[PDB]
């Protein structure tokens, strides 16, 4: 029983509860008949130059749950023949 694992002992269930309180938003944005995944804006400034003058890049990856729900639900199409019949060059 140090400081920190007692801290998380108490607070991680509270973080879970708090994000549950975050999930109910979508829920009354469901119940009233709206169906929308709340969108995340695309950020055009991901390319930058720092003080030592070199190229720095930021990676933003956006997960689409309507794609995921389709991804798990049905098979992918047949693997193209360029893939397995030719090896991966080392």
């Amino acid at each position: 029983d140090s400081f920190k694992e007692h801290y998380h002992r108490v607070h991680l269930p509270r973080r879970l509860a708090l994000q549950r309180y975050a999930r109910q938003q979508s829920l009354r944005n469901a119940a009233k008949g709206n169906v929308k995944a709340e969108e995340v804006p695309y950020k055009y400034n991901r390319w930058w130059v720092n003080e030592e003058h070199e190229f720095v890049h930021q990676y933003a990856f956006v997960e689409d749950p309507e794609v995921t729900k389709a991804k798990r639900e049905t098979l992918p199409p047949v693997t193209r023949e360029n893939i397995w019949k030719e090896p991966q060059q080392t």
Binding site: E5, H8, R9, L12, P13, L16, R20, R23, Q24, L27, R28, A30, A31, K32
Partner: protein, 166 residues
């Protein structure tokens, strides 16, 4: 089924709304700690505890009744006066009582949530004040009385219903 891929089904028929709510109160989903407790003198924390070296990864926090209960609260969460809740003007009075006792029975406290309780009770009195003028029976008193018993149980006593019965 009832939340993600078929959101309309609970709103359409209150019957299974109450049935699901009561089953969900019967197993106690909001105190999983007593799923693992063999002696009530020593309450077991199996559900609420995790350590980083891996104890209780399998018995860890299972969101179980989370989505359901939050959803079927938010079906009753229409506080907007623009449109009244669509199921509550669909329910039988006895049904209103039984789903109030549903909400009152699910929570670990044994007390209903304020918005829900207010909503249902205020929806009930506006039916009682209507139906007492029309065709009425002694059984329809049973509905009212075991409404007031729940109303006392959750600790907001109704002065109006009590002064109706007395």
């Amino acid at each position: 089924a009832l939340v993600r891929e078929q959101p309309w089904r609970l709103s359409a028929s209150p019957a299974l709304f109450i049935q699901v709510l009561q089953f969900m109160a019967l197993i106690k989903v909001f105190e999983p700690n007593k799923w693992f407790t063999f002696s009530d003198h020593a309450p077991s924390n199996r559900a609420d505890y995790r350590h980083a070296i891996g104890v209780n990864h399998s018995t860890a926090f299972w969101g179980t009744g989370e989505e359901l209960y939050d959803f079927m609260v938010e079906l009753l969460r229409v506080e907007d006066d623009g449109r009244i809740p669509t199921m509550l003007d669909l329910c039988t009075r006895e049904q209103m009582v039984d789903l109030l006792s549903g909400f009152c029975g699910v929570m670990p406290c044994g007390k209903a949530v304020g918005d829900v309780f207010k909503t249902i009770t205020d929806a009930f009195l506006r039916r009682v004040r209507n139906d007492i003028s029309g065709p009425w029976s002694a059984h329809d008193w049973a509905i009212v009385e075991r409404m007031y018993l729940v109303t006392v149980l959750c600790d907001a006593g109704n002065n109006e219903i009590l002064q109706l019965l007395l």
